[PDB]
Amino acid sequence: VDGASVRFDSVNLYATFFPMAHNTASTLEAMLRNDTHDQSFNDYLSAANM
């Protein structure tokens, strides 16, 4: 009602990679591409809010 609001001017995405030898990054990528093992996470709260 009284105060003003924020005003975005520019947004950028930053991302830092671990500098890893291409010899072993290909191997790690080869493993993670396998069907047997894939990342799996669960919400910490893990609840259905009503």
Partner: peptide, 27 residues
């Protein structure tokens, strides 16, 4: 094979500790 990636604490690599786990819920 992959022991060459681990820091060496002497003549042996610093490996072990099968704690590749995750269990995080409010419970």
């Amino acid at each position: 094979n992959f022991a060459s990636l681990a820091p060496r604490h002497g003549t042996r690599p610093f490996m072990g500790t099968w704690n590749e786990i995750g269990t995080s819920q409010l419970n």
